[PDB]
Amino acid sequence: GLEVLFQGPVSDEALTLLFSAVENGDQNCIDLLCNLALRNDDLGHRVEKFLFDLFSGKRTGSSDIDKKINQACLVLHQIANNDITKDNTEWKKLHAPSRLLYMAGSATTDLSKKIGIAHKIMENLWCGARMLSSDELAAATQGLVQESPLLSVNYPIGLIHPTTKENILSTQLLEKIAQSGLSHNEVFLVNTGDHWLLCLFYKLAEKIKCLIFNTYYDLNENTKQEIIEAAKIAGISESDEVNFIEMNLQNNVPNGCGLFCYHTIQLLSNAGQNDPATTLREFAENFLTLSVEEQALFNTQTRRQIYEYSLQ
Ligand SMILES: [K+]
Ligand SMILES: [K+]
């Protein structure tokens, strides 16, 4: 029944058939899966994505298919570190930032066998406590909203410039207003040391509303004031109109401030006709009712879905 994988463009159904076979099969089906995702052709590309979507939680799967993927990742790890593969740098999937190389590098805990892999992708890319860089966050948050014209995300900045003490959020706002104006929803991602803040500017019928989403410990009145000063540039009247939503969610999600910024923008993109403050506050409250494992799974899955934008 798997003969259809080699007959013309591969159906989304034929792919589910493949992973159904892997779920119920043994080492042959795993080896077949790896062989197919290693291909340069369109079929290899389709298999590679479907596999990555299951590896990242973008597609749900049985707990049995997750265990097959862990094996596929280990097989690819061994192929990526094999001497034959290293001698043939023309094999793009094994020498470039690919989904396949990322999955391969997630197979052990020995960094000694992830060095070359990491270099080809760009250091421990698979750490669950990585404080996200601005470029990595910029790629993911903006790719996330390509199909949402009403939702605009800006390049991640710091709140205050180190060598001049100037409000950068004040300048980014000014420039965005001059360059394109403020969209229906305007997202600004602002760094305050270790922390990424989600600054959402949204209009409620000719009335600008501001909203700050903090997923760590609460903020200093100093940093809060610098934000408000910037917030007033966008047409916010008095400091009381700025809504600071602050709930620490980063106990079991270390340095996950950028992770929550990403997932938040996704929530806003899929619930367009609603209230941002409610959408976010309900998430943060619901997130605290989850188990340690459900949170650690969010940590892992969001990190993998984020880095996909830094891959080909
Ligand atoms: K957009
Ligand atoms: K705009």
Residue numbers in the entry: 15 to 136, 151 to 340
What does the paper say about this structure?
Due to low-sequence similarities, all structures were experimentally phased (see the Experimental Procedures). The crystallized full-length SseL construct comprised an additional N-terminal ∼135-residue helical domain (see below). The crystal structure of full-length SseL revealed an unannotated N-terminal domain, in which eight helices form a superhelical structure. In bacterial examples, the analogous region is either disordered in the absence of substrate (SseL) or not part of the crystallized construct (RickCE). Mutations in the S1 site of SseL confirmed the Ub binding mode predicted based on analogous Ub/Ubl-bound structures. Likewise, solvent-exposed hydrophobic residues within SseL VR-2 (Tyr183 and Ile196) abolished or reduced DUB activity, respectively. Interestingly, deletion of the putative substrate-binding VR-1 region alone (SseL ΔVR-1) or removal of the N-terminal domain including VR-1 (SseL ΔN) abolished diUb cleavage, suggesting that the disordered sequence indeed contributes to substrate binding. Examination of the SseL, ChlaDUB1, and RickCE structures revealed a conserved hydrophobic region near the catalytic Cys, and mutating residues in this patch on SseL simultaneously reduced activity toward K63-linked diUb, while improving hydrolysis of K48-linked diUb. Inspection of the SseL VHS structure identified two solvent-exposed hydrophobic patches centered on Leu46 and Trp105 as potential Ub-interacting surfaces. Ub binding was unaffected with a SseL L46R mutant, but abrogated in a SseL W105A mutant. Therefore, the N-terminal VHS domain of SseL serves to localize its catalytic DUB function through an additional Ub binding site.
CE clan proteases, specific hydrolases for ubiquitin-like modifications (SUMO and NEDD8) in eukaryotes, reportedly serve as bacterial effector proteins with deSUMOylase, deubiquitinase, or, even, acetyltransferase activities. Here, we characterize bacterial CE protease activities, revealing K63-linkage-specific deubiquitinases in human pathogens, such as Salmonella, Escherichia, and Shigella, as well as ubiquitin/ubiquitin-like cross-reactive enzymes in Chlamydia, Rickettsia, and Xanthomonas. Five crystal structures, including ubiquitin/ubiquitin-like complexes, explain substrate specificities and redefine relationships across the CE clan. A comparison to the previously determined SENP2-SUMO2 and NEDP1∼NEDD8 complexes (Reverter and Lima, 2004, Reverter et al., 2005, Shen et al., 2005) revealed differences among bacterial CE DUBs in three variable regions (VRs) near the substrate binding (S1) site that were arranged around a structurally conserved helix (constant region, CR).
